[PDB]
Amino acid sequence: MSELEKAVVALIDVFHQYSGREGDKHKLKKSELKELINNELSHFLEEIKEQEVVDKVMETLDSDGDGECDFQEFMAFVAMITTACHEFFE
Amino acid sequence: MSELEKAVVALIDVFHQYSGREGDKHKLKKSELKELINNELSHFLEEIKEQEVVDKVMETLDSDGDGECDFQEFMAFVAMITTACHEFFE
Numbered sequence: 001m002s003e004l005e006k007a008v009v010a011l012i013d014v015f016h017q018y019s020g021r022e023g024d025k026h027k028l029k030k031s032e033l034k035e036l037i038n039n040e041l042s043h044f045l046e047e048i049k050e051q052e053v054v055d056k057v058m059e060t061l062d063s064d065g066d067g068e069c070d071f072q073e074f075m076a077f078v079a080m081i082t083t084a085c086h087e088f089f090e
Numbered sequence: 091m092s093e094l095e096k097a098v099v100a101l102i103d104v105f106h107q108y109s110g111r112e113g114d115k116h117k118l119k120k121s122e123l124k125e126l127i128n129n130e131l132s133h134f135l136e137e138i139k140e141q142e143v144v145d146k147v148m149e150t151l152d153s154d155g156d157g158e159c160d161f162q163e164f165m166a167f168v169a170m171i172t173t174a175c176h177e178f179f180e
């Protein structure tokens with residue numbers, strides 16, 4: 001596998017890890033999203049401790065309004081982060 | 091680094107590898123995009139041999155119409171692939 005292919009499988013993998021935990025196994029509810037961010041982006045994002053922040057983040061990512069973050073909304077999240085990092089460095 | 095963080099840095103890294111080669115070092119012209127797909131997605135995508143395919147792919151990815159693929163359009167490409175892979179498996 002190339003680095004890129006590895007990156008794609010890792011994205012799918014981490015999403016699966018967190019989404020399968022509770023309820024809809026293909027969507028991230030607030031607690032799952034909070035755990036993903038806290039455990040997997042601890043070097044990029046501030047750790048979420050407040051409900052207000054979990055709610056704001058979910059609201060921002062929840063494009064279809066079903067209260068959860070699906071795979072597409074997750075990829076939209078990944079793109080926001082990756083694009084911010086990219087613009088940041090040059 | 092988490093798997094996810096590694097994934098983000100890899101995305102940025104591969105884009106940088108191919109974009110810096112020629113012309114605008116922050117954008118993928120057709121030849122660069124072709125080489126990225128051929129060398130880095132050889133297990134997910136058919137190898138591109140025809141100009142018609144390079145042109146179709148570029149056209150599809152080129153949202154702002156500047157003839158090249160920037161980082162955002164690239165992330166849109168990554169999302170298409172990753173989302174197709176994800177839907178494919180469950």
Ligand SMILES: *c1c(O)c(OC)c(OC)c(O)c1[C@@H](CC)c1ccccc1
Pocket residue numbers: 043044045080081082084085086088098099
């Ligand atoms: C984002 C990425 O991708 C990154 O690469 C490893 C690094 O570290 C070199 C970061 O610090 C970030 C950070 C800040 C630059 C970031 C995360 C989310 C949104 C904007 C920036």
Ligand SMILES: *c1c(O)c(OC)c(OC)c(O)c1[C@@H](CC)c1ccccc1
Pocket residue numbers: 008009012133134135170171172174175176178
């Ligand atoms: C997508 C992924 O993630 C994958 O895992 C490595 C494999 O290989 C087992 C694929 O073949 C794909 C395919 C769909 C099955 C794909 C490739 C590019 C774009 C969309 C889907």
Ligand SMILES: [Ca+2]
Pocket residue numbers: 018019020021022023024025026027028029032
């Ligand atoms: Ca879930």
Ligand SMILES: [Ca+2]
Pocket residue numbers: 061062063064065066067068069070073
């Ligand atoms: Ca949603």
Ligand SMILES: [Ca+2]
Pocket residue numbers: 108109110111112113114115116117118119122
């Ligand atoms: Ca270039």
Ligand SMILES: [Ca+2]
Pocket residue numbers: 151152153154155156157158159160163
């Ligand atoms: Ca463009």
